[PDB]
């Protein structure tokens, strides 16, 4: 129950060299429950 709001900000967070401070977690062992945050850093066990 709620709403989502989004607006484009190409004019404020782009920079010509590309902005690299933005991050996300692509590799993760388990799916998080709703309303959770994961700021820890650990090496991904991709293989054996």
């Amino acid at each position, epitope marked *: 129950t709620g709403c989502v709001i989004a*607006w*484009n900000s*190409n*004019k404020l967070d782009s920079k*010509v060299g590309g902005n690299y401070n933005y991050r996300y977690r692509l590799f993760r062992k388990s799916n998080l429950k709703p309303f959770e945050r994961d700021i820890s850093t650990e090496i991904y066990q991709a293989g054996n």
Partner: nanobody
Framework: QVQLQESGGGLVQPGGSLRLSCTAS????????TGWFRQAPGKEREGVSC????????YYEDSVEGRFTISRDNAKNTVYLQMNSLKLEDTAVYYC??????????????????????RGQGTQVTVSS
């Protein structure tokens, strides 16, 4: 009978900064696309920058990248062009213009083709020592 009025310009030292302003009397912003054009003596007129209608992606020319900025204030209905790091070659007159719809770079078109409906008187910007 809509007028577009410009303010700014004058004698500025190279390496200085200026803020040109264009204000629309009849029409309102955030509905048109607003561009700046520049004409030099003995040369043909060339654009400077453009903002489209909705939100407005800022488009710049090849010779003005990284130095000139553009912004649009809908509270005062005024578009602002920020001159930073001026060289010697831009001693010329500037005009502001508007066109209905998002016209700047939608497909294989670009605002170098001067076909805007609303025009302005223009202001003179001069760099000298």
């Amino acid at each position: 009978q809509v007028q577009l009025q410009e303010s700014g310009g004058g004698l500025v030292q190279p390496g200085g900064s200026l803020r040109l302003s264009c204000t629309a009397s009849g029409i309102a912003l955030h509905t048109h696309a607003t561009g700046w054009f520049r004409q030099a003596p003995g040369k043909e007129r060339e654009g400077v920058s453009c903002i489209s209608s909705g939100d407005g992606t800022t488009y710049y020319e090849d010779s003005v990248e990284g130095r000139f900025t553009i912004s649009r204030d809908n509270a005062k209905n005024t578009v602002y062009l920020q001159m930073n790091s001026l060289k010697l070659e831009d001693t010329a007159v500037y005009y502001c213009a508007a066109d209905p719809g998002a016209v700047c770079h939608s497909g294989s078109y670009y605002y170098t083709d001067d076909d805007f409906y609303y025009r302005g008187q223009g202001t003179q910007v001069t760099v000298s020592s």
